[PDB]
Chains A and B, each alone.
Chain A
Amino acid sequence: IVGGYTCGANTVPYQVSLNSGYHFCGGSLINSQWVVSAAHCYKSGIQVRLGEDNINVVEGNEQFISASKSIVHPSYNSNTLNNDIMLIKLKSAASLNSRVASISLPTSCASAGTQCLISGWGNTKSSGTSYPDVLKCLKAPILSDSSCKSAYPGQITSNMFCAGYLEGGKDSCQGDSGGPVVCSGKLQGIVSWGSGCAQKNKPGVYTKVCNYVSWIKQTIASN
């Protein structure tokens, strides 16, 4: 997260870290046994880390649970980044509490202008590299479909939306992939892509979660 702020320990209790030794992606807990992330975050042997703040120091609220299943959307297109969503099943149900909690799936899509909360342990600089210990947060509005398509002509599918700032300086960044975009209590987005980080006229592009509710439900029900 570039140009964001320190969330505060466990203030985003649905935020998880995808780990294979070290953090490599974000994700969102949507119930006690399932995590939503980006399809391009797929790899074998994922460990899910819940209740995390400082990802380098055991602070006592963590849970470390291996993924038993990592299910990429079967229509994921690595060329267009369409359907960039993945579902991870936990080997065991996480213990839900005030610091480890699920985020609701949306019942309807969000509108342009709606302010959302984006979070992650990704890069905090738009040029260079700087990895935070603790979770960083960013308030960002959803942009109009027109301004999104103007930013990325011919590259935005109906399953994507832009959020952030056309002036740059504030954005999600590398290391944030798979993480949450939460709007009015609903998981509406998944950190996916963009052109660099916090660059002018290149806001973040996010997987539009509201278009995947049925696939998510079916997948959970059948796994």
Chain B
Amino acid sequence: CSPSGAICSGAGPPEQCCSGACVPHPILRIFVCQ
């Protein structure tokens, strides 16, 4: 699983992030792990 702040896939499974949440970055136009 990915650390907080690391790039993730919006439509991916939330378990891709260790935090269990893939969220919009406020500035960059990517999703990152919560």
Contact = CB atoms under 8 A, between A and B. Distances in A.
A40 B11 contact: no
Contact of B28 (A20, A23, A43, A193): A193
Nearest to A25: B30
Contacts of A41: 7, 30
Contacts of B25: 174
A6 B30 CA distance: 21
B9 A24 contact: yes
Q: For chain A, which range describes its interface: under 10, 10 to 19, 20 to 34, or 35 or more residues?
A: 20 to 34
Interface of B is mostly: loop
Contacts of B29: 38, 122, 172-177, 191-194, 197, 204
Contacts of A20: 9
A129 B34 CA distance: 15
* Interface-centre pick from A172, A174, A196 (highest chain B CB count, 10 A): A174
A123 interface: yes
Interface string A122-136: 110000010100000
B7 A174 contact: no
Interface of A: 20-25, 38, 40-43, 81, 122-123, 129, 131, 172-177, 191-197, 204
For the complex of A and B, 3 pairs with smallest distance between CB atoms: A22-B9, A177-B29, A174-B24
26 contacts: A20-B9, A22-B11, A23-B10, A24-B9, A24-B12, A24-B31, A25-B30, A38-B29, A40-B7, A41-B30, A43-B7, A129-B10, A131-B10, A174-B10, A174-B25, A174-B29, A175-B10, A177-B29, A177-B30, A192-B28, A193-B29, A194-B27, A194-B29, A195-B26, A196-B26, A197-B24
